[model samples]
Target: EVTIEFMHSSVEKERLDVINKLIADFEKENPTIKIKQIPVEEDAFNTKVVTLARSGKLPAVMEVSQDFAKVMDKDELIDQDAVKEVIDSVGEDKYYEGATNLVRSEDGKSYIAAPLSGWVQGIWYNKKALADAGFEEPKNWADIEKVAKKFTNKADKKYGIAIPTAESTMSEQAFSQFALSNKANVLDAKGNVTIDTPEMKEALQYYKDLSAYTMPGSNDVTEIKDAFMNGTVPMAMYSTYILPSVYEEGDPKNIGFAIPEEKEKAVYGTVSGLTISAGLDDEQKKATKKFVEYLSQPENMATWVLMSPGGAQPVNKEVVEQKAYKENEVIKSFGDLPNEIAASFNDIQVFGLVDGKNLTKMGDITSSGIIAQMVNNVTVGGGDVSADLKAAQKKAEEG
Candidate 1:
């Protein structure tokens, strides 16, 4: 029997159930293949994957994050062509346009990662709260402030909005996406870091201003999800992945999802996909390719979409356009988003040029402090807008 080990972390509980069911079906259909599943905590998963890839001991096939895919390609630890073939067979045009872009390297070569699922950033609001506050859907930053001010009633324990502030990847992502959506070019067209631009300054100031409406609590990313679920915050900008839990547990009819307004609605997109180890033998590699191809078949793709938690948009257009999917309210709501608005995490290329290296370490570091400071300036300091992003720009350069 052919044995294939799979490792995935950070997948939602519902998605895990779907994956388990898929594996069972796969094993039943192909008795020759035996699959072993290993789950790791999200915090440790990336480090372990890097360690294994460096040691030339990665599993046969495993889930990979979009950011890590670039590093893997740089190290030549993954088979780019093998992954590309699967994506091509699946039809790059069939996937969300942004999802396909994230799997590519700066060199324009398809990387070893093929999207397993897709995510986007959007506003999740409480319909009842919004109406009660006499607020309409916000169309811009100014509109957001108006709505927040209207809904905020701290003495009564009701908050208008929530923004992530803990020094974590989510916080950084939330702030950066907001900046980009506002037509702020944090990176120049030449792919150089340019966070000090006036647009970025304005964007940062806006995020800081909005924090005043947040519920009293730490900006911990985990807590943000719970806060929204429990109605502590009437609106939040978050990953679409949280839809299932919110819909199933929270008051679904009261919740609404939409792209947040800015100078432009540039939403952040992240795609998770499978990558193969370059260390595998030629024969083993051939088997791996076959398995990857099988997993991406139309029927299998549809099954994956149907089984996953509500928020993952289908990469396969055919699956998304199917009559069954068209009739599903949850799928239809998410699918309504314009694919062009879905910007890949890598598209914010300025962060790639920090320190004159295509590395993100500097940006990641500066992002944590910058976001908090921005929030402070807006809420506590009363809308103080300054081009102090130069500090972050310089820090990244010095690093």
Candidate 2:
């Protein structure tokens, strides 16, 4: 008999019920195993997981965010062979190729992690708002600008867009997704940092231009949500995860979602996967693997998608092809996404090195002040595009 413990950071009161029920069903099916679950707040859970891993007391399995995968891989605290085995068992051809690529290490070593959900960043809008403005869904950058101008009339409290620039991750994501869409490569073929390029220049300029139509003080996170929900902004680029909550009971009836029409439908994908802990004993490890395999089964995956909150897309190809998903509006939207966009997650270690270490030094070289100067000049201030980017490239190389 094997006893396996699992921890998840995204535990809410409603989700706890769903998780507990799943665990019970899983245990009944595998009579020889005992499974224990711990649910914690996101930040607290992340901190505890890190500390436990370092102390060699981690649970058998845990849920990790996609952004932390590279950092965890660099620390050598996960079992690559076991992870690869499970991935192979599922058949790499059974899931999105890009998602599979994101789960592997830079050197192609597989980790014990398998993606739990699929998420992509895109532009979301209110259908009613667009219709009222006599506009259709924008097909490209120029169309989006025109739509923004036509919909925005701040005196009537209806602004064109609501972009959140105050939050670090949100701001970075906005820039990075656009840059990637423009074919900007953050890391070159040799794994070296390469953020300064013609593509990146265009990417930054596009963001700065879009910012002009955003509501006053749109940078405030608190105000940003209210502004959008209250119908102050007709459009915004945000993660799809919040769709369910935003459109639930008591939410606006005018709400709608769509991907941005750009030269390329390239967007950032955020993925989290289930991973077994290195600290688990052999018996426990086996049980952990069993649980993951069970979860990844096509029928079980389809059931999970049906029950989960809106906005989660399945990674399993079999689940995606089900008739039920084809008939469901929300699920159907997700089904259409992979076909329309090129998706990839950033390499966290590379991002940390560039943003945390190099960006600060480059910012100091200009009058804008280190990080602030670089961002303002390149993204908002519209400073010398090539010169600013070249400076960033040099700083990244030095770091």
Candidate 3:
């Protein structure tokens, strides 16, 4: 029997049992193939993947972050023949609208990976605070300005919002909400830099204008959580990571969620896909590719999403339309999220995934905190908005 080394970070009991059962069935379908599975804790996943990669002993199949593809196979992981065959049988219409291209190659001529699941971005707000201040919840950037000013008063020792400006991801994440929602992606669909646009300039100015209503220090996850918990700040852009707890522990009567009201709202987050190792021998290649195709088949995909049913939304069109999203009886409060994604969708690192070869440079940029520093320069340091964006763009371009 030929052995395929499989790796994943999933630990959900129900989800794991279902997927494991499927893997066992695959082995039965082809008795000559044996599956060796490795389960890694999510927190240490990167380190394990890196060590395996450095030693050149990658598993036949890999469950990786979207960005991990940037460092692997140059979109050559899956067998080109198998991709075309699977796409044919499943039919093209089975996938999400925007997810098609990301799963395909940079040339858009061949498929690369199978998009498993993803998160949607939104602004989490406290309804009670808005009612107390007699301000409407923000629908767009202008409303945000009105609400922020109305809430913050020097005499009252309170702040209107919490926009992180530290040399950390908080600075970048906070800035992207305003910039992207204002109809500027800071990059074009073709992966070209477009940070110097009119929409961006307007958004940047609005961003600086609102800094007057922000908390004193920035980017403290603990401090910011305390601020929201105690009502020092009422609204902020949030990821699924933080919201699940808020929903479980906080009073829902005081909670509300909406895509940032904009001419059109765009939700942003990560999309991870299932990829294969291009270095695999022919036997390994055929086996792993079949596994991906099996995973992508509509019925199996429906089962795959259950691991993070309430958390990771599906990337397949058919899987999304299944009764699970609505009838699962869990995560009802996240109902608006699917609509939020359909309204306007984008990757968390816009420029990163678009540019194939240099994508990991985004991690470099984030870790170096250059973009965060640039955000601070514009919002807190009062640095020239246009110049600051240009400076960050230069670093990204260089990388």
Candidate 4:
């Protein structure tokens, strides 16, 4: 008998119960294989992985974000072939194109993880409010700015858009959507720092100017979300995680989603998938592959995604067609909106993923918080765009 360990960041009781049931079914089918589960809290997950990897005791499989998968691949800790086999067996065409691209290896010839669940970040607006004010859905940067300017009444404490301006991660994430839409990226295909280009300057300048119609001071996740939910702002840059709250407290039928576009459309997105560890014995490797492939099946994938329903979206086309996923209470509450959001997954874009190359250095840049600081300086600190861009470029180059 072979026993393989699987580590994931799902420690809540309800989530654990669902995963436990999946594992039990798999074990019963493959009686020769036994599974050992390790559940870690989200806050302490990275630290645990680091410690485990250093000790050469890494689990056979792990549930990791696309960013974290890059860090693991850089260290040569992932079994790319094993992971690729599972994805190939599941059929590449069955998965969302954007989701598969996010997990592609640095060389773009292989995959580092199997796409599981993901979320896309974009502008979510109130459809009824925009229509009542004589406006259709915002299509481009000019359209967004026009709608934002028309709704601003600073004296009356009303704003057009609620965006993140704080020196936090959310600010960098929200600002990336606009910058990437304008064909600006933090790194090029050769992995050189490209944060101070003309395209990036235009994006930053627009963001700074747009801040005039937003709420005063720094606005992080809580502030922006609260403003949007309380009717203080008609539009907000947020992730799919906001849907659960919308279904419960707000009007689900009257909301619309829009992607920022200039040179091209870009929707900031991320994926969390299962990855295999390297250097496993032959028996252990075979068992691990069997278990991972089982989980990638459409029925099992539907179950995994339904753990959080509206918050965790399906990355596979077949998973959406599953009966259980189609009949989910929170999912059915939004009608055709969920299908629209699912289709937009193809337009996913991020800062370091340029021209089919997923640069690993981006993980370092994100952790350094240089982009977030630069965004805060221009918007809340009233600093010059070119100067701030140059400063960020210099800092990244020095590192």
Candidate 5:
């Protein structure tokens, strides 16, 4: 029997169960291709992929992260043509338009990764807090400022939002949401630096102002979620339901999903997919190809999204439209947001530069905290928005 060793780190609990059963279905259909599964903890996932890829110890099937993509070549790690052929047979239009560009080389020739499911970053606020503040969900920069001010109560130690500055990754996640909401992507079409635009300036200024409502000190994801769950932070930005600890206890059930539109109704999101390891033998490659297609099937895609509805938005257009997706508990939270997954960089996504390019080589640059420092300049140092953006452009260029 053919066996493929597959590894991914995105799902937990219920979501993980769905994938396990889905693979069982695949085995029933394929008959000969047995699969070995390995799921890692999200915290250890990045380091794990790097260790495996660098040491040439990657499994037959592996999930790649943005940081991993920045360092390794698509061809170096995966069989692009094989995955491409599978997608072609399935139908390109099944995914969001032009999503394959991310996995493609700089010249748009070869493919690296296949688009899987995605996540949208936005405001996750306590429902009761907004109701008490006597306002609807923040719809724009103006509305957000108003709600933030209303929600900030010094006596209660409650802040309006949790904007992460201490952690560059979370800062990137939050800022991209605001920047995209204002229609200011890091790069323009054809990949040119476009951050010094009017919209970017407005977004920067708003982020700086919004920081005042957040708690003092450089905040991280853990602190942000803790404050939110305990009600010290009424609203904070999130990509997933991060309160696994709280979810286990089961009390704070009033969180609401709000991706407010300012100039546009967009938010920062991610597109993640599986890649074939070059280490795989011919038999493993063949099995992986079939496995990719089996997982990519429209109905199967719907089940994956339902598995982690809050964390994973669908890549397939048909899956989002299906009744199966509509009835899912987590899928029903955002209400029609699957229509615009913020995936496929065909529109806007993080890991992009003002030069209309992806900020590849993310390892050194992210650890250096260039974007986080830029955020500090405008928010805390009272630096000029334009100057900081220009400097931000320079740092990205330098990298």
Candidate 6:
């Protein structure tokens, strides 16, 4: 029998059980093929991948984020051709254009990973609260600022919106939507670093100015979610993970999601996909392709996404149309909002994804925390926007 190893971050017993069943079914159909599973904790995933790759013992298949896939692709550790075949077999048209874009290679001719599940980040607001305050959903930057300004009552410890201002990755992620919406990208089309620019200056200044109405200290995920959940803020810039809390404690119908738009709408998102490693024997390649294709099927993809329900979203259009996905308790509780959130995947945009290229250097930039530091300096450190932008540009270019 031909046995192929599969490494992923889903280590929980329940999630493993689900995967076990899928593998069992696959093995049953292909009696000569065996699937070996390697479950790793997310915190140690990158280090583990590095050690395995260095030893020439990389698994036949891996579950990786789109950003990390760029790093692996740069090292020639990914079988782009094999991945492209799987995506083709699954029908490239079946996936969201934006979702596929995240996994696309620098030249846009091939894919590094087959698109799987993803999550989106945007503005989540209380529909009734905005309506009660004579405000429509915050569409653009100006509208969001206006609502935030109107809602601020510093004496009462109330703020307009809860946003990330800490010197953390969350801060960079929260600010990217505004920056990208205003036509600012960390890299230009030619792959040159372009962090300091007029477009970026405008977005950073706007984010800093808007921070005046938020909570008093550095607001990260915990502060942002708490303020929004406790009704301390009318809106918050957060991810789709907030849905579970809303379903448990808040009015589902009262929640509305809005994409921050200017020159264009930008919704920050990340895709976690199954990718084939480079350099496999012919038998292993064929078997790996079959396993990936089997998992890519609409039914199986639906089952995988349902493991996390609201937090893990469907990347393929067919997955959303699946009966199993449509009847989930958390998904059903939100009404049309689930559909709206899923459709927002088309508007997905993030830093370093300039034009059609997902630059590998962005992986380093993000990990170095340069962008996050720049954001925190301007928003919470009282640093000048031009000065901070220039410093960030210098640091990124130097690296």
Q: What is the TM-score of each candidate against the true structure?
A: 0.78, 0.79, 0.80, 0.97, 0.77, 0.97
**What lDDT does the true structure give each of the candidates?**
0.66, 0.62, 0.65, 0.90, 0.69, 0.91
lDDT of 6 at 249: 89
Superposed model 6: Cα runs more than 4 Å off: none
lDDT score at residue 61, model 6, on the 0-100 scale:
97
Ranking by lDDT: 6, 4, 5, 1, 3, 2
Off by over 4 Å in 3: 11-19, 25-33, 74-92, 101-104, 127-137, 154-158, 182-198, 252-254, 261-264, 281-283, 297-304, 320-329, 333-349, 352-367
* Number of colliding residue pairs in each model: 2, 3, 1, 0, 10, 0
- Looking at model 2, the pairs that clash are 83-112, 363-370, 364-370
TM-score between model 2 and native: 0.79
Look at candidate 5 and give me any clashing residue pairs. 186-354, 187-356, 191-355, 191-356, 192-354, 192-355, 192-356, 193-354, 193-355, 194-354
**lDDT per residue as tens, model 5, 80-179:** 6776776786887777643554455444455566667666567877777688868776778888878888778777787888777664677866887788
lDDT of candidate 6 over 1-399, digit per residue (tens): 999999988898999999999999999999989999999987889889999999999999998988888888999999999999999988988888789889989887899998789999998999988999899988889999999999999999999999999999999998999999999999887778998899999999999999998997799999999999999999999998998888888888889998999989999999998999999999999999999999989999999999854678889989878999899777787889888888898898898887777877788888999999998988789899999999999999888
Let me know the TM-score candidate 3 reaches against the reference structure. 0.80
Stronger candidate by TM-score (3 vs 4): 4
Cα lDDT tens digits, model 1, 1-399, are 677777777377876787787788877877777777777776788889878766767888877777777667667778888888878877777666656666665555565587766777766788777878787667577887787777789898777777776645666567776686666654554556677777888778777777778766456557777778887777787887677786578654566665545765555666677788776777667667777777776567666656655676556556655666566666545444423223232232223332222343434544546545544444444545564466666654554
The global Cα lDDT (0 to 1) of model 2 is: 0.62
The C-alpha stretches of model 4 lying farther than 4 A from their native spots are none
Query: Looking at model 1, which ten-residue stretch has the lowest summed lDDT?
Result: 348-357
C-alpha positional error of residue 315 in candidate 3 after TM-score superposition, expressed in Å? 2.1
lDDT of 1 at 76: 78
lDDT tens digits, residue span 1-399, model 3: 688988887776776787689898888887888888887777887678778777877787777776566556453444545555566666767666445545556555655556677665565678888888787657787788888788787677677776666666766666666676676755555666666778877777787888888776554466566667677778765555555566577664466655554655545565676777666788877787777777776566767765654556667666656666556544456555444443333333343444322333445556667667877887667789889877877876665
Which ten-residue region of model 3 has the weakest summed lDDT? Answer: 342-351
Best by lDDT: 6
Q: List model 2 lDDT by residue over 1-399, tens digit each.
A: 778878876477777777777788899999999887888787787778788877877777777765565556556667666677777888887876656655666555464378767666666777776898788776567777787777777688677877655534556655665665565645654556566767777876776777677765436345556666676777876766656656453233455555443555545565677776665577777788889877777776766666665666666667756676557665444444433322222221212222222121222222222323444554445466678777767765665
Q: What TM-score does model 6 achieve against the real structure?
A: 0.97
Writing each residue's lDDT as its tens digit, candidate 4 over 228-327 gives 8999999988999888889889988988998999889898889988999999999999999999999999999989888854678888988878999889
RMSD (CA, angstroms), candidate 5: 4.4
